[model samples]
Target: SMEQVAMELRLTELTRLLRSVLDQLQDKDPARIFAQPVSLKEVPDYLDHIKHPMDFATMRKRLEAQGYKNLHEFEEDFDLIIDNCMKYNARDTVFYRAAVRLRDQGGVVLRQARREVDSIG
Candidate 1:
């Protein structure tokens, strides 16, 4: 299992890094739209428009379930959540703006984590 692999690697540090990154993203998102998955029933076009939808809840599940391979795998979902918002919402929309800001802020945290924790080499 991925959990066993992570235990050998510094899983606690990676887990902490992910928790911090998600927490920062949550605080930055005032509307909290990215907190959960978009409802297909509410936004019927969301599924059609977003080829691969993602959200914080799903991200947390991956973390808790120990589904990630490494820091970069966790980051992919982080980027997906923001990317989906940017794609579905226009530049003039709040969702788009928040996603943009989140992309910027989340990038900083991820970059820092890579430098500090993911520096295995």
Candidate 2:
């Protein structure tokens, strides 16, 4: 049982690392770095993909599967990705940087999500 628990913890850490990398990647998009469109229907699934990139392949595939066909769709889901990253680990520098960028660009979709993150611990 201890071994199983340790494995689970390790997996969680790995997932967090993956999420961090995904956040960093998303930060590369200038449009997303500034502002993002918020569509509730797509946010949950987009968050899942960012937080579990190993299971979902690249971000592009994940977005495409969820009907994100272009830059606009990707922008729409950007805040969701940031929110998910913060949900898992708010202290993550990459996530915070991306969030700041989004805020600067006028995307504050994560305000509620940030509160959720604050309550997570």
Candidate 3:
């Protein structure tokens, strides 16, 4: 019973941290491209090239569902969100630059979350 309660507490704390990170990513995205999933119709190669695509919207869903069992799951989606962009777009393109910036900021956000969440449990 004691361990169970601690687990619940940790889950809530982690969820809160993940939500903050997700919001920060959206706020950082000026072009509004990372807010939702990539459109297959708009970018036909998106499906062909990127094996696993992720976005803020999907991550939000996982947060709501408590789908993330740990920090790594959240990090995976975060990395994929940026990785897919850089993978699909040419290095010189705006999308690639956006991903680069997001990559940097996302690292900071995740690192902060790790520090805070680890301290909690």
What tens-digit string does per-residue lDDT give for candidate 1 at 1-121? 9987767567766676668767877777777878999998889887778899899889888887657758778888888998888888889998898898888877777777788664752
Evaluated against the true structure, the overall lDDT of model 3 is 0.85
Worst 10 residues of 2 by lDDT: 51-60
Higher lDDT: candidate 2 or 3? 3
Location of the lowest summed lDDT over 10 successive residues in candidate 3: 112-121
Compared with the true structure, what per-residue lDDT tens digits does model 2 show for residues 56-91? Answer: 234545543433332343444554555655554467
- Tens digit per residue, CA lDDT, model 3, 79-118: 8989888888899999899999888877777788888767
Which ten-residue region of model 1 has the weakest summed lDDT? 112-121
Ranking by lDDT: 3, 1, 2
lDDT of each: 0.80, 0.46, 0.85
C-alpha lDDT of residue 76 in model 2 = 46
Residue 76 accuracy (lDDT) in model 1: 85
Model 2 — TM-score against the truth? 0.29
TM-score of each candidate? 0.83, 0.29, 0.89
* Model 3: CA > 4 A from native: 1-6
* Model 1 per-residue lDDT at 58: 90
lDDT of 2: 0.46
lDDT of 2 at 41: 75
